[PDB]
Design an enzyme around this catalytic site. Structure first.
Site, mmCIF file in Angstrom:
data_model
loop_
_atom_site.group_PDB
_atom_site.id
_atom_site.type_symbol
_atom_site.label_atom_id
_atom_site.label_comp_id
_atom_site.label_asym_id
_atom_site.label_seq_id
_atom_site.Cartn_x
_atom_site.Cartn_y
_atom_site.Cartn_z
ATOM 1 N N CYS A 76 -5.918 7.179 -0.374
ATOM 2 C CA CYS A 76 -5.045 7.088 -1.556
ATOM 3 C C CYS A 76 -6.015 6.007 -2.202
ATOM 4 C CB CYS A 76 -3.966 6.844 -1.753
ATOM 5 S SG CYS A 76 -3.397 6.980 -3.579
ATOM 6 N N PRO A 77 -6.787 6.312 -3.358
ATOM 7 C CA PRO A 77 -7.761 5.009 -3.769
ATOM 8 C C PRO A 77 -6.849 4.339 -4.527
ATOM 9 C CG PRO A 77 -7.824 7.198 -5.296
ATOM 10 C CD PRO A 77 -7.337 7.442 -3.793
#
Lengths: 301, 293
Positions: free
Chosen positions: A36-37
């Site tokens: 997940c960025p």
């Protein structure tokens, strides 16, 4: 319709003296996924501010399932870990421990309080800012002085953040999660125009604002580092690639990654690719492409 | 079992306006016959009907069934799908209903539906109706035959079919077993084509045609949709990239039969691979200009 509409984060508390959440060592814990960025933002900054022995971390499995993010014992994957504290099986279990009636989405990152067993904050943009100052008393004077959102650069950071978030950070999701052709095109065209804008900004520059590392770089980095390895193909963000379409972006990207270990040590490409390509609704075969080779080119120096 | 030829004194005599090609612009096998048709100047000798690129449960539809710019109605039998032609020729036919179809309008049968044999027919069968320069062209000449065959063998197996073996794989293992030899064959081609304009004999042959139809679709379609993405042609294979751009931009037979909108529409409507049915707007452009670095 067919367009993607991100829901807002609803745990929006801070860590301040005299407040509900006092700065303490060993009290707060970060639950994140390497894929997940948004979550990766908090990991990058945790390492930039030297908070590794002050704020803890658990890596959930990249293999998002029908019940959300599993812990590593439920869905094993190299580097995915078990929940150390509540025998949780899914990130959801953390939320409903904090509030059995909670009805938001069960997202990472989670900045968690082990004392009162609640979610302090699950908004990545606020967590990294918490990290700027909240734990400075537990740091040496020079590490404490590090600040990625300083007053003198604040407005310029805010001005770039506003459209980077809307058309780039979220833009790739609006394109990849679009379910109509019209929605897809309405997201991807502004995405690449914003990349054209960023390319000029970064021409001959090492940082977006003020010739120094700021959160605008962190926030953009987590999208761009994922671009060629995942967003180009899986999210159809393919008008051109970073490595061959945007040389200024590409150079900036490679310097962050190769010269600043906080960006490379928190970048796990196997988690990234496994997670996006396991999305059944977009990629039913679940095959993970072997390219691009490499995930990020050398700096060349 | 439709593997007949066009020869004087044979079942299918060379005649003008008698034979017809049913094709889809999106299919590379079929595009072979379109490219060779224009190389040999056969356009006013052999007709063509473009079927719809929007492959359906009933196979290739005609353009009145599944409209799409440039897709056409069947001019002769009110066919709705390509199968209708096959079953006109033989109600018992139980093969695949593939394009290209080289069709005989006189007896209403399929002469040939094997692209590799169709383009060879075109080398000589109609030379009596052509100007001297078009008649002299031969893409499979005797002196290069063995060399063309040698390269065709692994190009066809690991590149022409290879992008499909990768893109239609349903396991991680099958996918990798197909894509890795694909890119090894591309590495091999890269070496062959370094400093050359043609695969064999410093002249255009069917080997170039057969490789071109895959490679011209590589960056616009196979990279993303079929996951053939270790690297791209335009950024990963400069020798292949130059060979490709020279064919496309210097030879109208290669570019006028190349309809990228048909190509992308056809691949990205494959619901089993791309359930959203969205067609990417990139890459931009579909093929770079000849004088690009």
């Amino acid at each position: 319709d067919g367009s993607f509409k991100r829901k807002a984060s609803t745990f929006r508390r801070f860590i301040e003296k005299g407040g509900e959440f006092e700065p303490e060592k060993g009290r707060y814990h970060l639950y994140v996924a390497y894929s997940c960025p948004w979550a990766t933002r908090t990991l990058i900054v945790r390492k930039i501010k030297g908070l590794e022995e002050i704020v803890g971390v658990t890596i959930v499995s990249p293999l998002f399932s029908a019940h959300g993010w599993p812990f590593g014992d439920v869905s094993p994957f190299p580097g995915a870990e078990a929940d150390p504290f509540y025998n949780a099986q899914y990130v959801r279990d953390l939320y409903l421990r904090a509030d059995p009636k909670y009805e938001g989405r069960f997202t990472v990152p989670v900045l968690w309080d082990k004392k009162t067993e609640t979610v302090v904050n699950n908004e990545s943009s606020e967590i990294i800012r918490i990290f700027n100052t909240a734990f400075n008393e537990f740091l040496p004077a020079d590490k404490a002085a590090i600040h990625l959102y300083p007053e003198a650069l604040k407005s310029e950071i805010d001005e770039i953040n506003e459209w980077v978030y809307d058309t780039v950070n979220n833009g790739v999701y609006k394109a990849g999660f679009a379910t109509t052709q019209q929605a897809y095109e309405a997201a991807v065209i502004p995405l690449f125009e914003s990349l054209d804008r960023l390319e000029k900004i970064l021409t001959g520059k090492d940082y977006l604002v003020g010739d120094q590392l700021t959160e605008a770089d962190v926030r953009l980095f987590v999208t761009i580092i994922r671009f060629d390895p995942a967003y180009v193909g899986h999210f159809k963000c393919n008008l051109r690639t970073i490595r061959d379409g945007y040389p200024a972006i590409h150079l900036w990207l490679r310097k962050l990654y190769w010269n600043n270990s906080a960006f490379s040590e928190t970048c796990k490409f196997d988690h990234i690719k496994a997670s996006y390509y396991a999305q059944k609704n977009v990629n039913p075969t679940l095959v993970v492409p072997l390219g691009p080779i490499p995930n990020i080119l050398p700096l060349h120096h």
